A and B are shown apart, each in its own frame.
Chain A
Amino acid sequence: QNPMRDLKIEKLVLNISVGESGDRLTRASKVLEQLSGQTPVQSKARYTVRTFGIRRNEKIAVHVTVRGPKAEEILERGLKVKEYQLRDRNFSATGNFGFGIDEHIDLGIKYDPSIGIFGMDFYVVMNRPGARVTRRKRCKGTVGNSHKTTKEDTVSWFKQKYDADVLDK
Chain B
Amino acid sequence: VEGLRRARYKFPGQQKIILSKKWGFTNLDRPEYLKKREAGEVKDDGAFVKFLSKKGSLENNIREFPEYFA
A–B interface present (Cβ within 8 A):
no
